[PDB]
């Protein structure tokens, strides 16, 4: 499924390369221009355990997932992910848990040492 297909086909986008967050493109977002550190950044996504679960969803509230790039305010690997993306972008990433919830995981949904799947759809990002 689609989390294999990420694991084995994804591309590395760390900057150490260690294959902490791998990446596949699922549609191409448009331009070139991705957004910047501390821009309003509004996506919606879906995330999956490597049991299958599907812990969250923004589709399911009916309202996008808010934040401010590049400021810890989610895990590593959205900061890194979504630094990547253009607007429109749909993109798999794969999240190992040095760059998402590491051994302390967050309950109550995610275990100790998860492994995150993640669709992740770009909407807009605007300076504040
Ligand atoms: C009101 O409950 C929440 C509290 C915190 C929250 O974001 C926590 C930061 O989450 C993350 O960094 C990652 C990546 C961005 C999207 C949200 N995640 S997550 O899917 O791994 C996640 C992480 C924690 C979490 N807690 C919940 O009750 S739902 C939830 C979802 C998200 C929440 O629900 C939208």
Redesign the pocket.
Known sequence: GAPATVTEQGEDITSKKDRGVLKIVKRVGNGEETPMIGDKVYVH?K?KLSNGKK??S?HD?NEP?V?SLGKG???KA?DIGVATMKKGEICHLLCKPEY??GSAG?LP??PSNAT?F?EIELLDFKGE
């Open positions: 996504y995330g812990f969250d923004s509230r997932f934040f305010q989610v895990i959205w998402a919830y967050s949904k995610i995150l993640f």
